[model samples]
Target: MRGSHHHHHHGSEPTTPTTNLKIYKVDDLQKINGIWQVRNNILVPTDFTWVDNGIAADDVIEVTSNGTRTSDQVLQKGGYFVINPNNVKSVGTPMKGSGGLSWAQVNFTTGGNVWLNTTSKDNLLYGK
Candidate 1:
């Protein structure tokens, strides 16, 4: 049998999210680092990391919990949380944007009179 050389590449690159989760200050407009020391002892690191992007209210997260915490202990409330617009179960006055205008969604998913524009008056666009 003759020797042959063959090479093959498999799988697409994992799409790392290019955006960070949104978190507003319980005090002011300052953006918290990947971790926020809320008070004397409570630290809110979940909202600071990219892995918590898909977490939602009442959703079961697999992060290490305080071992002594009861199984049903709901660790939501005063602490920071994940920012997932996709899982918004309730409608509100203003919903999440499409993240941002992609190069295609901007250069392609748009046209003269029938294009998408933000409802923000400050960021509003006009059509002809």
Candidate 2:
């Protein structure tokens, strides 16, 4: 004679929403040997022209890497980001990336080569 047995298991799952937005703060942006570069280990490509004047410290730069469905997706076309300052706002066009370093060229509506750093993450949602 033989006997049969049945077993069942249940587990709970966690759900959380994920976003693909990257933000950086501008500590300073400068030009070295005709190439734009940001501070804090960030790099800038050499294709951007030196227009306007420059960006200042504490300015916020928001980046959206994935642009698949909406307008935000265009961010990847040139690898650019939005510049949010305390007094004004600007837009930087994407230039290029290499060796895991992404660079953008921003022609401020109002200024140079300087450095930038991401110092805060709780400034605003979607950089709005």
Candidate 3:
């Protein structure tokens, strides 16, 4: 199914071809304390198996606009998702995840993370 944006800011980002590119909307990103949370939810954006399996820095894209906190990385069509928004650790040029959707950090229940094949499946929860 088509997923909509929850947190809309700036404007429409560059449309990275959905074929091999895994797109995570910046709107879905959350924050707790001082950490920026990527889309690690059990639903849309799914799990983090792809990142673990070998998703390189250029393979993934974090959707964004010019007004995002890390506006410097913002391109005309897409913007970089910043990891450490304040102290600035990851420029997000390398995509990351969060919570049930996290590739590096496990924030929810165990054994639920996997690579979601959005290319074939209409539902965001389905994975391989």
Which structure among the candidates has the greatest lDDT? 2
* lDDT of residue 14 for candidate 1: 47
**Tens-digit lDDT track of model 3 for 51-112:** 33222222223334332333343212122332221221221112234233323321122212
- Predictions in order: lDDT: 0.23, 0.33, 0.29
Off by over 4 Å in 1: 1-14, 24-56, 59-73, 89-128
Clashing pairs in 3: 1-122, 13-77, 14-77, 14-78, 40-100, 40-101, 98-102
> How does model 1 fare in lDDT?
0.23
Error of 1 at 89 (Å): 6.2
lDDT of 2 at 117: 19
TM-score: which candidate is best? 2
Residue 10 lDDT in model 1?
Answer: 68
Clash tally for model 1: 0
Residue ranges of candidate 3 with Cα displaced over 4 Å: 1-19, 40-128
Candidate 2 lDDT, 30-118, residue by residue in tens: 55234333332233222222232223222334354442223342222234344443223333443333333333343332233222211
